[PDB]
Amino acid sequence: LDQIPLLEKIPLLAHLTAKQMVNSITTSNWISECCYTYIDSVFVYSGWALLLELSYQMYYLRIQGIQGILDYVYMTLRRIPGMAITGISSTISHPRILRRCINLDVIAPINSPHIASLDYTKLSIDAVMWGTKQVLTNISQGIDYEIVVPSESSDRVLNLVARKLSLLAIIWANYNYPPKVKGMSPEDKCQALTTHLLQTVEQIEKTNIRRMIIEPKLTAYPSNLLSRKLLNAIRDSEEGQFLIASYYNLTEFDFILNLPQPPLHHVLRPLGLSSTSWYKTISVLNYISHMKISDGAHLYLAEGSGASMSLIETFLPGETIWYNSLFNSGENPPQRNFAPLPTQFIESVPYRLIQAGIAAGNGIVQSFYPLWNGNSDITDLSTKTSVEYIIHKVGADTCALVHVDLEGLERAQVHALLITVTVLKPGGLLILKASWEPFNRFSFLLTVLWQFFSTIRILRSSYSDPNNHEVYIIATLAVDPTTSSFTTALNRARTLNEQGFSLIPPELVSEYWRKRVEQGQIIQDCIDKVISECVRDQYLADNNIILQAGGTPSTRKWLDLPDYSSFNELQSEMARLITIHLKEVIEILKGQAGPLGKINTILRLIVERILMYTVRNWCILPTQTRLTLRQSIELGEFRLRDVITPMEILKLSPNRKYLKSALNQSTFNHLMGETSDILLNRAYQKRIWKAIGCVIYCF
Numbered sequence: 001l002d003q004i005p006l007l008e009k010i011p012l013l014a015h016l017t018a019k020q021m022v023n024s025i026t027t028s029n030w031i032s033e034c035c036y037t038y039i040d041s042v043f044v045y046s047g048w049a050l051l052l053e054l055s056y057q058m059y060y061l062r063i064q065g066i067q068g069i070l071d072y073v074y075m076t077l078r079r080i081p082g083m084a085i086t087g088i089s090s091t092i093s094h095p096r097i098l099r100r101c102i103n104l105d106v107i108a109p110i111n112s113p114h115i116a117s118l119d120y121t122k123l124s125i126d127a128v129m130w131g132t133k134q135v136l137t138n139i140s141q142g143i144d145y146e147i148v149v150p151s152e153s154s155d156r157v158l159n160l161v162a163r164k165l166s167l168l169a170i171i172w173a174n175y176n177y178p179p180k181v182k183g184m185s186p187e188d189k190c191q192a193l194t195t196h197l198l199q200t201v202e203q204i205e206k207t208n209i210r211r212m213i214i215e216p217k218l219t220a221y222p223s224n225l226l227s228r229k230l231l232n233a234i235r236d237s238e239e240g241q242f243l244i245a246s247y248y249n250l251t252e253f254d255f256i257l258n259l260p261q262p263p264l265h266h267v268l269r270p271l272g273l274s275s276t277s278w279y280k281t282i283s284v285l286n287y288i289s290h291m292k293i294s295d296g297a298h299l300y301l302a303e304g305s306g307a308s309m310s311l312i313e314t315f316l317p318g319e320t321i322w323y324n325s326l327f328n329s330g331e332n333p334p335q336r337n338f339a340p341l342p343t344q345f346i347e348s349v350p351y352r353l354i355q356a357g358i359a360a361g362n363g364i365v366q367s368f369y370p371l372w373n374g375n376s377d378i379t380d381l382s383t384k385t386s387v388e389y390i391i392h393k394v395g396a397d398t399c400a401l402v403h404v405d406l407e408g409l410e411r412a413q414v415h416a417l418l419i420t421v422t423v424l425k426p427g428g429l430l431i432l433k434a435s436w437e438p439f440n441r442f443s444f445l446l447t448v449l450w451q452f453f454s455t456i457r458i459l460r461s462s463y464s465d466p467n468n469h470e471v472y473i474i475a476t477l478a479v480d481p482t483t484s485s486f487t488t489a490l491n492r493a494r495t496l497n498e499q500g501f502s503l504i505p506p507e508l509v510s511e512y513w514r515k516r517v518e519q520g521q522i523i524q525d526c527i528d529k530v531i532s533e534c535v536r537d538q539y540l541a542d543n544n545i546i547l548q549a550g551g552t553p554s555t556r557k558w559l560d561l562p563d564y565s566s567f568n569e570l571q572s573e574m575a576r577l578i579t580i581h582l583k584e585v586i587e588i589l590k591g592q593a594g595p596l597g598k599i600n601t602i603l604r605l606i607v608e609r610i611l612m613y614t615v616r617n618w619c620i621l622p623t624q625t626r627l628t629l630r631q632s633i634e635l636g637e638f639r640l641r642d643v644i645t646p647m648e649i650l651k652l653s654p655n656r657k658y659l660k661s662a663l664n665q666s667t668f669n670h671l672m673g674e675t676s677d678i679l680l681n682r683a684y685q686k687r688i689w690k691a692i693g694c695v696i697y698c699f
Contacts, residue, residue, distance in 0.1 A: 001221060002229055006240055009230050013037045015148055016227040018045035021088050025080060026053055027335070029090040033227065034097050036234045036244055040104045046088075047073075047131030048145050055163040055170070059181060061580060062656070064173035066136045067562060071577050071609060073132050077125045078605050086334075088124040093333045100248060102347070106130050108557035109343045110273045111687060113304045114327055116338035126557070133560065140171060142208030146217040153222035155186055161216050162189035168196055168213065175202040250541040253522050254283035254462035255515045256474070257508055258455070259446065262634045263682065264527050265465045266689040268539070270697035271546040273554040274344050275305035276690065277405065279463035282542055284431060284472055285315060287459060291476075293318075294362055296400030296425045299390075300324060301381060301416045306342025308403060311549040313350040317360040318401065321350075321368045322394050328376035340372050340379065349550035369393075381419075382411040391422050400428035408435040409444055417445075418486040421452055424477045432473035434458075436512070443502035444493050445473075450503065451489040454478040458512070463542070466520040531630055534619050534696050543697065555694035561616040563699065568652075570617045571644050574610050575652035581606050582671065583658050589667060603671065607678045611638050615691050619699040633688060639677045646672045 004012065017033040021042075034042055050073060058072050077085075091097055092107070098115075101107035106127050112118045135145065147164060149157050162181075169178040169192055176199045179191055196213045200206050234240040251268075269276040298318035300309045304325045313321065327340035345351055350366060353359075360366050371390055377383045381390075402420045406412055420430050430453065436442055450456055457474035464470040483489060496503065530538060564570045585602050588595045614621070614629060621629070628642045646669050650659060659668055680688065 001223065001226075002233075006233075006237055006243070009233055010037050010240070010243070011041050012148075013227060013230040013234065014039075014041035015045040015146070016150075016225050016230065018042050019049050019148065019150075020225055020227070021046050021091075022049035022053060024087045025077075025084050026050070027090075028087055029094075029335075030087070031091050031094045031097060033231055034091050035094075036231060036240075038247065039097060039100045040106055043101075043106055043127045043131035044134050045131070045145075046128050047133070047135045050076075050128065051132060051135060051167055052147070052160065052163050055167040058170055059166040059178070061583070062173075062654070063170055063580060064576070064654075066140065066171060067573065068576060068580065069136060069167075069170065070129070070133060070560075072580070074125075074129055074609065075581055075602075075605050077128055079601065082121050085121050085124055088128070089120040089333070090335060092124050092127060093120045093336050095336075095338070101127060103248070105557075108273060108554060109347070110554050110558055111683075112274055112343055113325070114338070115341050115343045115346075116327070116329075116332045116336065118333075118343070120333050129560065136171065139168065139212075142205065142212065144208070144212035144217050146219055149218065149220040150226060151222070151224045152220045157218060157220060158189065159186040161218065162186055162192065164216060165189055165192045165196065165213070169199065172196075172199045172202075175199055250539055251283075251462040251523075251526075252286075253519050254286070255460060255519065256287055257458040257512055259450075259458060259504070259508065261467050262636070263465070263686045263689055264531075264634070265463075265523065266686045267527055267530055267693040267696070268463060268523075269690050270693035271543050271551045271553055272307060272344065272690075273347065273552075275307050277305070278307045278311035278546060278549065278551070279542070280461040280470070280472070281308040281311050282463060282545055283459060283461040284474070285312075285545075287457070287474060288429065288431070289315065291429065293401040293429045295319075296428065297322065297394060297398050298401040298403070299394055299399050299420075299423065301402070301404040301419065302326065302406045302412075303342065303403065304405075306345030306348075307551075308405065309342065310345045310348035310350055311545065311551075312401070312403065313360075313366065314348075314549045315361075316401070317350075317362045317364075317366060318399075319362075319364050319367065320399075321366055322371050322390075322399075323368065324371040324379065324381075324390065326376075326379045327372070328379070329374070330376070340370055347550065349548070352550060380412070381406065381415045384415075387415045387419055390419055394423050396422050397425055399423050400425045401431070402428070403431050405433040407433070408438070409441060413445075414448075414490065417448065421477075421486055426477055426479050426481070428477045430473065430475050430477065432475070434471045434473050436469035436471050439502070440497065442471075443504055444497055447493040447496055447503045448489050449473065449475055451492070452478055452481050452483045458508075460512075460516065460519065462519070462523065466523045469516070530696060531692065532623060532627065534626070534699075536619075536696065536699055538697075553694045553698055555616075555691050555698065559612055559616045559691060559695070561613055564617055564620065567617075567620055567622065570613065570620065571648055572652045574613060574644050575649050576654075577609060577613075578606060578649055579653040579656065579659060582668070585671065586658060586664065586667065603676050604678055607638065607640055607676055610640060610643065611678075611688075614643050615688060616695060618692050618695050633680070633685065636680050636682075636685060637677050638680060639674065641673060 013033060014037045017030050054073060058069060063069060063072055092101060107123055109115060109118055147160055179195055200209050269279050293316050297320035299322045301324050303309050303323055306323060323342060325340055332338050354366050354368055371393055378386050378389050380386055402424060404416045406416055434445055453475040455476045459472045459474050461472055585599055588599060625642060632639045632642055659665060
């Protein structure tokens with residue numbers, strides 16, 4: 001104690017703080033310790049400690065295989081109250097620890113437009129799951145992990161080594177059936193000790209495997225969580241801080257016109273964390289790359305995740321970039337002061353090159369200043385204060401590109417319009433996220449823009465939704481604008497709108513409709529073919545643009561499930577999963593006949609796990625079940641019976657006392673049919689279809 005070298009203190013501090021976290025879950029926080037230790041080791045030892053705690057429970061449930069342990073720990077973490085995990089949530093939510101976790105691939109910020117909106121409880125659960133997977137893999141390969149016994153200088157150490165031995169038996173329960181340990185003394189773990197040498201026979205370099213069995217690593221500590229001494233030694237030591245710092249340091253169906261449905265189109269978006277509007281941007285680049293917009297600043301109104309901002313910046317770089325999106329500090333996680341930062345732009349190439357100081361393509365380092373002083377009304381463009389502040393900071397006649405993507409005149413749209421009119425450099429470009437379906441609004445917008453813009457081009461993105469009549473306006477600020485003011489343009493636009501025909505010629509409307517019907521049909525056939533055939537490589541240039549922009553397939557971190565090479569093994573996996581995790585459900589159901597809420601949450605967790613199993617292994621499904629899963633998801637629900645049938649569940653799962661009695665089988669079939677079907681929100685549907693696209697693209 002206290003005599004180990006400095007190189008050994010940091011992993012020991014990580015082990016001790018991980019033990020503290022695990023005891024906490026099974027204002028208090030651990031940022032002080034985690035900022036001065038190995039955060040990846042912290043989560044690895046957290047997984048190790050949680051595995052030690054759950055070893056006996058998983059052994060008495062006859063869990064087999066690494067994935068069985070992973071599913072059990074996932075549901076255990078998902079079933080704890082959110083107040084209990086707030087200790088780990090607070091540590092992860094800290095900006096330094098958050099960036100550390102992101103950079104060590106432990107944490108990926110997904111499904112949140114802003115960092116402050118991230119589900120840090122789910123984020124902590126994901127980190128602990130990653131640590132558990134790392135521990136299981138390292139144990140399987142033979143990397144033994146030290147067990148610490150604080151407050152011991154007995155029998156509890158013999159129990160702890162028994163927990164580790166039972167974990168090891170559980171890992172290889174497929175090859176050989178583990179013996180019973182129920183109702184047995186902590187000393188009689190020698191039976192398990194003996195059978196692990198038998199299991200070791202059935203595979204390479206066994207020396208490390210056997211060493212962790214016969215000679216378990218153990219380290220008893222007379223003091224108790226000891227961690228404070230290690231933390232003080234690390235902080236005081238100069239090298240220690242030096243060591244910590246060193247450790248942590250093609251779709252061409254788009255067309256241009258120069259002047260309540262399932263989100264199936266997201267499958268064609270197989271890249272990107274959170275929003276993926278760069279896909280709608282790709283078609284814009286094909287027309288705006290010819291002209292010059294790099295000079296001058298760029299302004300992005302309501303950009304949100306900043307995906308379009310990133311992909312515009314990589315190929316069209318600006319000197320100053322003024323992000324702007326709606327955000328209030330009220331939705332921050334406790335004890336955090338997160339600014340509105342686009343969680344997709346921060347991990348992209350432009351911000352990664354800004355932070356490390358490398359120059360951009362133009363040779364001028366991009367200066368990224370979000371428009372945020374602390375007022376929620378300031379982020380909301382409908383307020384006049386927002387307009388005045390935005391115009392103040394960017395400066396009138398300072399920028400050349402303005403990207404307005406405000407979703408569907410409303411006060412915010414006209415406010416965004418005269419922000420641009422005031423701030424664009426003469427000859428500057430505006431890209432606008434219009435909408436053709438309310439044609440009156442379209443005529444109004446076209447007239448007001450035409451008063452002071454020239455070369456107004458209407459472009460429908462080939463990657464946009466085929467049902468929303470979306471149009472991306474491509475217009476240039478007219479040189480030498482002699483327009484009196486914005487209000488005259490607006491009032492006069494009202495006149496034309498209420499006194500005469502719309503400025504759009506009927507021939508252009510007919511052309512738009514004629515190209516729109518064929519484009520929608522073609523895109524729908526492309527989506528249908530991609531979902532059905534599941535060809536791995538389709539439209540490589542578009543996704544290559546995303547990869548150059550800094551986008552990566554986010555299915556790796558959201559879908560950590562394995563990729564079975566056979567469909568029979570897939571079905572067998574849920575045959576184990578359902579039969580293992582419905583035991584509690586049946587137990588409480590028989591006990592009561594409060595509990596119904598637990599029943600429902602366990603059922604929902606099981607069905608969601610089955611859903612992600614299906615999505616991860618979507619490619620290897622036969623086309624018939626692929627088709628029926630697509631049909632089920634289209635109405636917005638995930639029926640469990642399509643993937644696997646109750647007779648298959650009974651056949652492909654080990655025989656047990658559960659699922660053995662006529663009443664038990666009857667209630668299993670009752671809970672097995674439509675009564676366990678779950679519903680999916682629209683954002684959930686986009687998540688699922690994007691994940692399917694990612695799986696197809698990567699497999």
